[PDB]
Amino acid sequence: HMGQIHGLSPTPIPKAPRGLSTHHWLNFLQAAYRLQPGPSDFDFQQLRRFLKLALKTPIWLNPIDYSLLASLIPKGYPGRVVEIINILVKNQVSPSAPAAPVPTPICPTTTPPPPPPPSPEAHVPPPYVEPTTTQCF
Numbered sequence: 001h002m003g004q005i006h007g008l009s010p011t012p013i014p015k016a017p018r019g020l021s022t023h024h025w026l027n028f029l030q031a032a033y034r035l036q037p038g039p040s041d042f043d044f045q046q047l048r049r050f051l052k053l054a055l056k057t058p059i060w061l062n063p064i065d066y067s068l069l070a071s072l073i074p075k076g077y078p079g080r081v082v083e084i085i086n087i088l089v090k091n092q093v094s095p096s097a098p099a100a101p102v103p104t105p106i107c108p109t110t111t112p113p114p115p116p117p118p119s120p121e122a123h124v125p126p127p128y129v130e131p132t133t134t135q136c137f
Contacts, residue, residue, distance in 0.1 A: 020051055024066060031087035035080070046079040 001007055019025050032038070032047070053072065054060060060068035070085050099106060116122055 021064065024064070027066060027088055028084060031084040034087060035084060047081055047084075049079070050077065050081045 004010075004012055014021070020028065028047070032043070036043075050073075054069055057072060060066075060072070066085075066088065070082075070089050073082055073085065
């Protein structure tokens with residue numbers, strides 16, 4: 001009813017304007033608009049080049065998350081597209097589990113303290129004498 005059954009509640013269709021979602025794309029257009037003063041113009045070309053690229057990877061679409069977009073970026077990508085996205089990432093300040101994308105080595109897991117020596121005595125014991133201890137020597 002008025003949309004797609006119920007009322008476009010589940011929003012199955014990517015709305016009418018199919019363009020990397022709204023707030024989603026806007027998140028990219030906003031930064032672009034924040035940089036050089038390029039109203040519309042034809043700078044979106046260098047952009048569509050990166051977007052269309054990701055399009056080849058329908059893995060971020062399903063989950064719909066630009067978080068995977070910046071990922072597609074081969075860290076070093078040309079154009080100032082990243083320069084615009086960087087404005088989005090910098091707006092992350094969300095450090096994720098800094099441990100996973102590793103082969104194995106990363107840091108030593110020495111959380112607990114080291115074990116004692118092969119002896120009961122360690123801490124500077126008292127001299128005293130006692131009936132048991134005599135020493136003599």
